[PDB]
Amino acid sequence: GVKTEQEDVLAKELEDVNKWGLHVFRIAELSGNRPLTVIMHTIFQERDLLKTFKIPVDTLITYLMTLEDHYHADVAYHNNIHAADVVQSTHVLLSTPALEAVFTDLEILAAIFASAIHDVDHPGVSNQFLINTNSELALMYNDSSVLENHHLAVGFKLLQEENCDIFQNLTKKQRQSLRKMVIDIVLATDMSKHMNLLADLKTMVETKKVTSSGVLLLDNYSDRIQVLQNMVHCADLSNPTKPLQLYRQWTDRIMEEFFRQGDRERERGMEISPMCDKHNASVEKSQVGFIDYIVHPLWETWADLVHPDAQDILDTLEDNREWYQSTIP
Ligand SMILES: COc1ccccc1COc1cc(C2=NN(C3CCN(c4ccc5ncc([N+](=O)[O-])n5n4)CC3)C(=O)[C@H]3CCCC[C@H]23)ccc1OC
Ligand SMILES: [Mg+2]
Ligand SMILES: [Zn+2]
């Protein structure tokens, strides 16, 4: 009735779940490659989501293990560890003081569940790649947000496996509302929505109303969903805002995946893709561009929205950017 020592050591790492910079690779090791399961489980307990939504525990574990098993282990970046990290990041973002008591449990659950499924069954290559190779996924989704339509459909479909329906006691109203939120959040992880999402987040900060004390007011679906959409998208682009030991690992793993797409574009290649070659284009300049044009404009705008809650995160982002710069000849 008491834990094993590996389980204990894992429980002790998991005490860092509410903090930015969790040792997620270590959790993956300690969990036997189950970081998405142990983290989602921990989060659901801490947020009381099992009681609130009458989720049987064995059903949750069954679904989570099934979900984690359709993330590919032979993909270096877009795997269960990335899912876990994004779940845990979204989890922290939701506890930010500026958002205290703003969102409902169904919203919280949508944000978390979305984060969990958002890259499921990712094949390790890009939308453009899938489209140019005339792949079945691109044909099925009529070329638009191919991967993101796929992740949603797999995540939802897995609820139908044996003892996997975690939402079996939600009413139809809740299930319809949850389903819609989750669709809207995951579709927003397509990077081609980045510029519009960011515009709409800048507009919100311009017009930012406030409640009785420092907490945002969001009185319509369109704004609430916008915030949750930019929240999960922030989490998905959170690697450069982590301690550098973490960030470097993520960079290695993205580079492997992208070099591997390169190597799969020699025969086909439909001609090389953006800065993915050992021959040319530094890894370091690529991180500096990523941070300058994408990651920092987003996190900066997020930081005004939740001011001063994100200062530390933005500081780390800026330190990491100066570090990558300083490593360029
Ligand atoms: C810019 O970083 C590059 C570039 C090439 C190779 C490696 C990295 C490493 O950075 C990381 C990127 C990513 C992601 N990347 N992308 C996009 C980003 C924009 N993009 C280009 C292409 C060419 C170019 N020239 C100048 C720019 N520029 O700076 O504006 N670009 N941006 C296409 C690829 C995804 O689709 C996302 C899926 C979901 C979320 C995030 C994913 C994740 C972690 C990363 O590092 C840990
Ligand atoms: Mg994705
Ligand atoms: Zn992702």
Domains, the chain, ordered by start: 1-329 (1.10.1300.10)
Please list, in sequence order, all residues whose beta carbon lies within 8 angstroms of the beta carbon of residue 159, skipping any fewer than 6 positions away.
63, 165, 166, 167
Indicate which technique resolved this structure.
Answer: X-ray
Of the listed 23, 41, 72, 78, which one is catalytic? 78
φ, ψ (nearest 5 deg) of residue 69: -65, -10
User: Given phi > 0 = left and psi -120 to 50 = alpha, else beta, which region is 21?
Assistant: left
DSSP 248: H
The whole-angstrom separation of Cα 321 and Cα 298 is 14
Please list, in sequence order, all residues whose beta carbon lies within 8 angstroms of the beta carbon of residue 225, skipping any fewer than 6 positions away.
181, 184, 185
Ligand 3 centre distance from Cα of residue 72 (Å): 13
Ligand 1 centre distance from Cα of residue 102 (Å): 32
Give buried/exposed letters for 79-96 (b at 16+ CB in 10 A, else e).
bbbbbbbbbbbbbbbbeb
The amino acid present at 56, given as its one-letter code, is: P
Return the residue matching tokens 């100066």: 322
Return the residue matching tokens 């094993």: 4
DSSP 74: T
Q: Which two tokens stand for residue 157?
A: 């479909």
3-state class (DSSP) for residue 210: strand
Ligand 1 centre distance from Cα of residue 284 (Å): 12
3-state class (DSSP) for residue 216: strand
Which stretches does DSSP call E strand in the chain? none
Residue pair 124/260 in contact (Cβ under 8 Å)? The answer is yes
Terminal CA-CA length for the chain: 58
> How open is the CA angle 197-194-85, to the nearest 5 degrees?
100
Q: Does the active-site annotation cover 78?
A: yes
User: Given phi > 0 = left and psi -120 to 50 = alpha, else beta, which region is 190?
Assistant: beta
The whole-angstrom separation of Cα 77 and Cα 25 is 12
The whole-angstrom separation of Cα 171 and Cα 151 is 24
The whole-angstrom separation of Cα 139 and Cα 322 is 42
Residue pair 106/49 in contact (Cβ under 8 Å)? The answer is no
Among candidate residues 174, 167, 162, the one with its CA nearest the CA of residue 116: 167
Atom 25 (ligand 1) nearest CA: 274
The whole-angstrom separation of Cα 74 and Cα 92 is 28
DSSP codes joined into one string, 13-47: HGGGTTSTT--HHHHHHHTTS-HHHHHHHHHHHHT
3-state class (DSSP) for residue 132: helix
User: How many CB atoms neighbour CB 286 within 10 A?
Assistant: 18
Residue pair 127/162 in contact (Cβ under 8 Å)? The answer is no
What residues are in contact with ligand 1 under a 6 Å CB criterion? Answer: 191, 236-237, 239, 250-251, 254, 258, 274-276, 286, 289-290, 293-294
DSSP 321: H
Angle between helical axes of 296-305 and 221-236 (0-180°, round to 10) = 130
Atom 3 (ligand 1) nearest CA: 286
Residue pair 283/251 in contact (Cβ under 8 Å)? The answer is yes
